[PDB]
Design a protein around this ligand. Sequence first.
Ligand SMILES: Nc1nc2c(ncn2[C@@H]2O[C@H](COP(=O)(O)OP(=O)(O)NP(=O)(O)O)[C@@H](O)[C@H]2O)c(=O)[nH]1
Ligand SMILES: Nc1nc2c(ncn2[C@@H]2O[C@H](COP(=O)(O)OP(=O)(O)NP(=O)(O)O)[C@@H](O)[C@H]2O)c(=O)[nH]1
Ligand SMILES: [Mg+2]
Ligand SMILES: [Mg+2]
Lengths: 289, 294
Amino acid sequence: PLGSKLLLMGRSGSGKSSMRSIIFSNYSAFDTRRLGATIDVEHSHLRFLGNMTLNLWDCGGQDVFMENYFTKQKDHIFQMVQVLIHVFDVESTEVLKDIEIFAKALKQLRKYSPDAKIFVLLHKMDLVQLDKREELFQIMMKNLSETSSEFGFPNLIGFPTSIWDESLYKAWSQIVCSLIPNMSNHQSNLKKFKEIMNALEIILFERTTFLVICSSNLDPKRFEKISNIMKNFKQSCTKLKSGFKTLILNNNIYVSELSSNMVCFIVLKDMNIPQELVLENIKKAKEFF
Amino acid sequence: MVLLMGVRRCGKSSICKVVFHNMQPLDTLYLESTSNPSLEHFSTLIDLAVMELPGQLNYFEPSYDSERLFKSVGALVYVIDSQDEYINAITNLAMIIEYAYKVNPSINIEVLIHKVDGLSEDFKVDAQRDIMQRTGEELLELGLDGVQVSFYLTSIFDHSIYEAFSRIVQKLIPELSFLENMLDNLIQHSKIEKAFLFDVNSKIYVSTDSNPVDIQMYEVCSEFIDVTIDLFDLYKAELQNVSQLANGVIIYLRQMIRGLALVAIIRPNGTDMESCLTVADYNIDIFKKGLEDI
Ligand SMILES: Nc1nc2c(ncn2[C@@H]2O[C@H](COP(=O)(O)OP(=O)(O)NP(=O)(O)O)[C@@H](O)[C@H]2O)c(=O)[nH]1
Ligand SMILES: Nc1nc2c(ncn2[C@@H]2O[C@H](COP(=O)(O)OP(=O)(O)NP(=O)(O)O)[C@@H](O)[C@H]2O)c(=O)[nH]1
Ligand SMILES: [Mg+2]
Ligand SMILES: [Mg+2]
């Protein structure tokens, strides 16, 4: 109900553990190099939005382990899955073997968990130059979208993903959100909260990982870059041994805890209302409203 | 003028761009080889020139064009690798400062124990606290023991390229003593407990309290410049940022004269936030006047 199985599958070296470390273990991209190979599945019982427990099965991708997942352990690995997140190294040498295992997986999801949500990530994208990136993605997706549509899934969703930019945050925000039950509520209370403040915009971020939960409404990659900037800052505040609590920038931007499980990023239309009135509203708002 | 020199491939030009051009540390692991004496100019106002002489010519090396330049030099930044070659560069330095000290006696000799990347934290004390010995020993020969020597731990990927460049660029400043005093106690008629002036496009602390630093406080503030600058830039339509941590420590950044910025760690000990900010803001407005007077 509140416990979700998320399979994180994909061939070895594609960067699956890396992702887990950055979004849920406060690893910097650099830090990720020392992660060893993952032996068989490495489980993580992460706790999201206070009550949600996301159990991440980070399945070792080497072939030894991999032919296991599809034979011996098939009913174990594939029963009661809520989300497949398949990742693809783009500097991968065996693109067709890769799509092969994607299909081997999708197959088992089909008998065992037909309702599973499928996401794919074209990963390690910072190793391909900008002029060629969109083409690499579009060809790739044309293939996966059908490999997948064939097994009773798609419309498939996928992401050009990298450890070295904001894209990881866009992907994991979209991924982990499909699991929030509240959504309808959060979204609506957010609306009433935007209306009150005469806010030019209000994003709501899960507090500790800083994934975007929902937005109230120019640069279309704002949300993920704020997760990034905030996450850097969060780590930086470590240097004073205390947790970020509020930030206000100009008289424009206000960021503060809501519950012990969310953060709100409020941006006002202008810069000429005083603290007092503004700061009041955010108080409820809060947990209650 | 800061004079950057060493021996080829050390780090004199990677840090010359990673700092003033505000470049990335990655895009320097394959950079070329700048032979021409390039005089760049970055403005910390009043403007500070930085030349970077190509690192060779068998032991610089007395000439009309070795004395001409040190006459205008303010401090000599001798960068010095540590992937290898640990030993000769030392004598290089020794001589280079031998002639230097008879052209400019007011010259500050600053040496960077550069390229100290992923290389332990006990390996470091090793290289430093006795490499200094290697430099004093050659200074026990044709010369004298008593000299301006300073030894930093630059790393172009660390924060400490910037900390070093600050403790340096801060001594070549016209009235470091009254900037530091006026930002010292003149901002201890408040709850503020640490202040830094800051060029924002670089990130060298043009000054700090008379309280000896600790790099931790330096990082937070610089990193805070980033968080404020990046967020601001997401929505363009004072330049200040207040933020508070769960124990109560405030971090504050307000703009100053031309790309400078004050950043200060405020400890309320108990008092509310708006009041801390009011008192602080008052003294800070004073400080700001005591900047525009320059
Ligand atoms: N350039 C680049 N390197 C990346 C990226 N993501 C991960 N890496 C690097 O790629 C390597 C892969 O490590 P890892 O993340 O463990 O991949 P893996 O999928 O866990 N391996 P396995 O499935 O066998 O456990 C590491 O060196 C990591 O730093 C990325 O987007 N770009
Ligand atoms: N590991 C490491 N390498 C560094 C560091 N700083 C510079 N380098 C490396 O040093 C090499 C040469 O850098 P560069 O600054 O161009 O040398 P240079 O002193 O300008 N040479 P020249 O005298 O020809 O001007 C590069 O391979 C670069 O990656 C550092 O802090 N760590
Ligand atoms: Mg792994
Ligand atoms: Mg050079």
